[PDB]
């Protein structure tokens, strides 16, 4: 009832299943001809998953006014973070 991602570079991570719903294609490839619960997204480096999970948790960090602080800005990894946002 918790989910765990598999890192293509070799360092997978264990995360809450609340984030599983808040996603683009995780729901897509957690159901279907496969998995009717760990999937290796082999399309990414491991360090990117740290910021992905940080944003994922940040989703519930500020849910339902006015004042919200800034998410930790990626200084130099954003060029690859962009190519990753559309993928998922």
């Amino acid at each position: 009832m918790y989910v765990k991602l598999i890192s293509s570079d070799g360092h997978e991570f264990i995360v809450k299943r609340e984030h599983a719903l808040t996603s683009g294609t995780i729901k897509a490839m957690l159901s279907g001809p496969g998995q009717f619960n760990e999937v290796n997204f082999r399309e990414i480096p491991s360090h990117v998953l740290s910021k992905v999970c940080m944003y994922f948790t940040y989703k519930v960090r500020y849910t339902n006014s006015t004042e919200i602080p800034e998410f930790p800005i990626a200084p130099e990894i954003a060029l690859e973070l962009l190519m990753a946002a559309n993928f998922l």
Binding site: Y2, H11, F13, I14, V15, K16, C53, T57
Partner: protein, 39 residues
Amino acid sequence: MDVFLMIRRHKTTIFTDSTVFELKRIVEGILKRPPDEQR
């Protein structure tokens, strides 16, 4: 309340948000290992 644990095991990572023993119990709830072992 205010639970936000940046857990980082050996080549293992838990984003888990409780007594220190209860923390080991959560580690057992995942790694399924002895709480004393996961002191």
